Design a protein around this ligand. Structure first.
Ligand SMILES: *[C@@H]1O[C@H](CO[C@@H]2O[C@@H](C)[C@@H](O)[C@@H](O)[C@@H]2O)[C@@H](O[C@@H]2O[C@H](CO)[C@@H](O[C@@H]3O[C@H](CO[C@H]4O[C@H](CO)[C@@H](O)[C@H](O)[C@@H]4O)[C@@H](O)[C@H](O[C@H]4O[C@H](CO)[C@@H](O)[C@H](O)[C@@H]4O)[C@@H]3O)[C@H](O)[C@H]2NC(C)=O)[C@H](O)[C@H]1NC(C)=O
Ligand SMILES: *[C@@H]1O[C@H](CO)[C@@H](O[C@@H]2O[C@H](CO)[C@@H](O[C@@H]3O[C@H](CO[C@H]4O[C@H](CO)[C@@H](O)[C@H](O)[C@@H]4O)[C@@H](O)[C@H](O[C@H]4O[C@H](CO)[C@@H](O)[C@H](O)[C@@H]4O)[C@@H]3O)[C@H](O)[C@H]2NC(C)=O)[C@H](O)[C@H]1NC(C)=O
Ligand SMILES: *[C@@H]1O[C@H](CO)[C@@H](O[C@@H]2O[C@H](CO)[C@@H](O[C@@H]3O[C@H](CO)[C@@H](O)[C@H](O)[C@@H]3O)[C@H](O)[C@H]2NC(C)=O)[C@H](O)[C@H]1NC(C)=O
Ligand SMILES: *[C@@H]1O[C@H](CO)[C@@H](O[C@@H]2O[C@H](CO)[C@@H](O[C@@H]3O[C@H](CO)[C@@H](O)[C@H](O)[C@@H]3O)[C@H](O)[C@H]2NC(C)=O)[C@H](O)[C@H]1NC(C)=O
Ligand SMILES: *[C@@H]1O[C@H](CO)[C@@H](O[C@@H]2O[C@H](CO)[C@@H](O[C@@H]3O[C@H](CO)[C@@H](O)[C@H](O)[C@@H]3O)[C@H](O)[C@H]2NC(C)=O)[C@H](O)[C@H]1NC(C)=O
Ligand SMILES: *[C@@H]1O[C@H](CO)[C@@H](O[C@@H]2O[C@H](CO)[C@@H](O[C@@H]3O[C@H](CO)[C@@H](O)[C@H](O)[C@@H]3O)[C@H](O)[C@H]2NC(C)=O)[C@H](O)[C@H]1NC(C)=O
Ligand SMILES: *[C@@H]1O[C@H](CO)[C@@H](O)[C@H](O)[C@H]1NC(C)=O
Ligand SMILES: *[C@@H]1O[C@H](CO)[C@@H](O)[C@H](O)[C@H]1NC(C)=O
Ligand SMILES: [Zn+2]
Length: 616
């Protein structure tokens, strides 16, 4: 048994715990490196050969965590909370979390394979017309593309139900057992249930209470936005299917999960005549190419006097669709090998304005890793799990502005037209604000499941109850206790929390408002840029530098000034769209909210016979 993989002898003392932690850090980064190294190899070079390695390196990592966790859990758990330095408590607290590993091996297999099956079913789920069609439609491209692009209610419904039938129905039996074993494992760790464990990451004694108050402060913005989309859908589909006072059919909102309303912008766009300024056409004539795009992004960070990329980045990063033509996970991602000496971005970059914005986002993560690279490995993560995304986003917000684009040189004049930016801001409002209630209700639901507030006979009653109460949606078809629509969202059977994204979105604008205030800027917040503001850069740098050492709330108070999340900065960013929508809503007499919730559409006249009929 490798000494580099198994812990030694240590007393229950802080001096012992310090020695143990230090030993954990040294071996831990070694282990993490191997796992990610093969991961990067396969992800950058898609082949079954590397997949076998990826599986092997990840397997080793768990045995490592079990060895150290095993010793830690037995050794300090009776005393650990008393260690003086919170720094030490944080490291030990992370390692002492064993999770599933606690299960006896017979249950481990049952729990582990079970999780594997849930993932298979979701990705495997196939939706087939009630005809012996030669080939069915998978989640993407066909199902997502047809649902995002199609606008024939009859057609759109059938695709939506088919997905929930195929994905949802088979997960329901399995998910109960996962609930049983998952909570069983965490009980041995010391959490009342899986929910208590997920909430534990934010170190907020009133965490769930905090979110409700945040969400109630955003609801005025959401209801106004919801009312406007409801009206627009009514113009397109007709009163038979959109009750001005009631909830919106879930399948008509432009995406399989109604989590993003981005695809309906074409119907709702204010001031439809102003074109969205796309710099692609100028970018091409400028001779720019993917490789230069990244150095352009670095220049922005250098303007913020943050750390410029290490040469290791230019060497490692997989900036393009490789000319070798070997397969790659072209979906852009940012990687940090816990090896202090390197960090890499995988973009598969192609020259579009969107990717320019995307590259800035990804480079923000790299910047984030570099600033806390000095901390011990257990702390080299976001201040809170949602904190990581927020930093990446705020950087992306600043660069999207035409004010910034002119500074880079891609634009001759910064036309200060309110119709142009409202057009833009509404697309963002459809893209992300519509997401908040959804991101909140999924983890709102899951804590209920793990907590038992939703016993098994209610998996679907509560999901639609919650989904309607918060998001303002009801199902396209009456659905009952045989179903398990929770299983229809990727994050559910893959057991990945959603709350991180909701909290991240509030933190995104909360940081943004802080930097603008630091940058001496004034007036419209959505016209703010942090470029060249070194004094703001130092403030941002501080928040990154702390990593996970300091409790997330304590750091946030130093940055923005408030010990907790708040909606006020987010609202100010959207002040213009808030003002404009209310007038549009006020004129039409929209009922803000959704009384008479117990209303939903009739079925299509010949459903499912009429599902392919031309209606455009
Ligand atoms: C991605 O784009 C990279 C950026 O290219 C620059 O920016 C774009 C927007 C255009 O304006 C382009 O014309 C720019 O060069 C690109 O890197 C560039 O690659 C080109 C070749 O494709 C290189 O051209 C050579 O440049 C040198 C001079 O550059 C050095 O010195 C100047 C100062 O004098 C510095 O400002 C530079 O930064 C460099 O340090 C020339 O000596 C050489 O001249 C040759 O041609 C002329 C006739 O035109 C002859 O008289 C000479 O004798 C030579 O035969 C080349 O013109 C360029 O160096 C390089 N940029 C930089 C900054 O080094 C990259 O290739 C693109 N990548 C991909 C994958 O597409
Ligand atoms: C978590 O675990 C890892 C692994 O143990 C620790 O990583 C080490 O971090 C230290 C610094 O904290 C690194 O030390 C640096 O080494 C450089 C030389 O490296 C070469 O030489 C050594 C042998 O001497 C070889 O082993 C190595 O492979 C290289 O060939 C120095 O140049 C550095 O100088 C800096 O520090 C000195 C003081 O030490 C200053 O006076 C200088 O001004 C300069 O700032 C430095 O000494 C070490 O290399 C890292 N090892 C690994 C494997 O990454 C983490 O630090 C640890 N986390 C915590 C919180 O302890
Ligand atoms: C941590 O230190 C402990 C000692 O406090 C080490 O445990 C001891 O390890 C040795 C082998 O390395 C074991 O030896 C065996 O002892 C039995 C009698 O106990 C004897 O009959 C055998 O022939 C053999 O000599 C010993 O049992 C074991 N004792 C205990 C209490 O664990 C341990 O190796 C150290 N662990 C690490 C990770 O460094
Ligand atoms: C993408 O991943 C695959 C799998 O890891 C890599 O394929 C392997 O590449 C090496 C050389 O690049 C091959 O080794 C060579 O094989 C020949 C024939 O036996 C031998 O004459 C050489 O001496 C050397 O051993 C290897 O066989 C090949 N395949 C496998 C399964 O390992 C590929 O290189 C990766 N591409 C990139 C760009 O990283
Ligand atoms: C995850 O899903 C797979 C697929 O449903 C499960 O594997 C299957 O598990 C069952 C028993 O749990 C095996 O049943 C056996 O089938 C053979 C005929 O194939 C029959 O002769 C035996 O009497 C028995 O009924 C089935 O073979 C097995 N399939 C494979 C490919 O191994 C797996 O058990 C599921 N995991 C969990 C935790 O539910
Ligand atoms: C939950 O509600 C679902 C409806 O979404 C009910 O499932 C449906 O149940 C009916 C019968 O109760 C099924 O129709 C029957 O089909 C056969 C031919 O297959 C026909 O001969 C009968 O006359 C009748 O039309 C329907 O296929 C079935 N659909 C699904 C998706 O299950 C279910 O009964 C409800 N369950 C509970 C516990 O309330
Ligand atoms: C330390 O132990 C004492 C005595 O059991 C207990 O009162 C105290 O709460 C512990 N410290 C922490 C931080 O829980
Ligand atoms: C655009 O015009 C408004 C007029 O009130 C002004 O407040 C805003 O600062 C202007 N933006 C820029 C970038 O000049
Ligand atoms: Zn990101």
């Amino acid at each position: 048994l490798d000494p580099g993989l198994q812990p030694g002898n240590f007393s229950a003392d802080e001096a012992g715990a310090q020695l143990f932690a230090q030993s954990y850090n040294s071996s831990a980064e070694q282990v993490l490196f191997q796992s990610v190294a093969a991961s990067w190899a396969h992800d950058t070079n898609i082949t079954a050969e590397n997949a076998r390695r990826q599986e092997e390196a990840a397997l080793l990592s768990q045995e490592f965590a079990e060895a150290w966790g095993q010793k830690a859990k037995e050794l300090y758990e009776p005393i650990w909370q008393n260690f003086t330095d919170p720094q030490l408590r944080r490291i030990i607290g992370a390692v002492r979390t064993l999770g599933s590993a606690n299960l006896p091996l017979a249950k481990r297999q049952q729990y582990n394979a079970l999780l594997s099956n849930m993932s298979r079913i979701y990705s495997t789920a196939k939706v087939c017309l009630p005809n012996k069609t030669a080939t069915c439609w998978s989640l993407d491209p066909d199902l997502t593309n047809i649902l995002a692009s199609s606008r024939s209610y009859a057609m759109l419904l059938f695709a939506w139900e088919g997905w929930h039938n195929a994905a949802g129905i088979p997960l329901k039996p399995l998910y109960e057992d996962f609930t049983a074993l998952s909570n069983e494992a965490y009980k041995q760790d010391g959490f009342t249930d899986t929910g208590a464990y997920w909430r534990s990451w934010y170190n907020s004694p009133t965490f769930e209470d905090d979110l409700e108050h945040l969400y109630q402060q955003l609801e005025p913005l959401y209801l106004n936005l919801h009312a406007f989309v409801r009206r627009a859908l009514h113009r397109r589909y007709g009163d038979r299917y959109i009750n001005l006072r009631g909830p919106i059919p879930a399948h008509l909102l432009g995406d399989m999960w109604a989590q993003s309303w981005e695809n309906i912008y074409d119907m709702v766009v204010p001031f439809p005549d102003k074109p969205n300024l796309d710099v692609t056409s100028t970018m091409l004539q400028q001779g720019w190419n993917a490789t230069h795009m990244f150095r352009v992004a670095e220049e922005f960070f250098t303007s913020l006097e943050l750390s410029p990329m290490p040469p290791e980045f230019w060497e490692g990063s997989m900036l393009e669709k490789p000319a070798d033509g070997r397969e790659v996970v072209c979906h852009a991602s940012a990687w940090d090998f816990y090896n202090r000496k390197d960090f890499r971005i995988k973009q598969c970059t192609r020259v579009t304005m969107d990717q320019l914005s995307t590259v800035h986002h990804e480079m923000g993560h790299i910047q984030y890793y570099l600033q806390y690279k000095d901390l011990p490995v257990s702390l080299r993560r976001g201040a809170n799990p949602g904190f990581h995304e927020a930093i990446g986003d705020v950087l992306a917000l600043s660069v999207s502005t035409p004010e910034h684009l002119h500074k880079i040189g891609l634009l001759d004049r910064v036309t200060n037209d309110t119709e142009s930016d409202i057009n833009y801001l509404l697309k963002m409002a459809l893209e992300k604000i519509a997401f908040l209630p959804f991101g909140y209700l999924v983890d709102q639901w899951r804590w209920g499941v793990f907590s038992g507030r939703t016993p098994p006979s209610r998996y679907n009653f509560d999901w639609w109850y919650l989904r309607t109460k918060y998001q303002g949606i009801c199902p396209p078809v009456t659905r009952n206790e045989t179903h398990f629509d929770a299983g229809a969202k990727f994050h559910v059977p893959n057991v990945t929390p959603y709350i991180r994204y909701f909290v991240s979105f509030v933190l995104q604008f909360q940081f943004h408002e802080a930097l603008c205030k630091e940058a001496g800027y004034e007036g419209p917040l959505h016209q703010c840029d942090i470029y060249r503001s070194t004094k703001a850069g130092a403030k941002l740098r501080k928040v990154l530098q702390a990593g996970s050492s300091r409790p997330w709330q304590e750091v946030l108070k130093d940055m923005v000034g408030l010990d907790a999340l708040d909606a006020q900065p987010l609202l100010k960013y959207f002040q213009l769209v808030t003002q404009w929508l209310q007038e549009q809503n006020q004129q039409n007499g929209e009922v803000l909210g959704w009384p008479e919730y117990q209303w939903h559409p009739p079925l299509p006249d010949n459903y499912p016979e009429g599902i392919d009929l031309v209606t455009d």
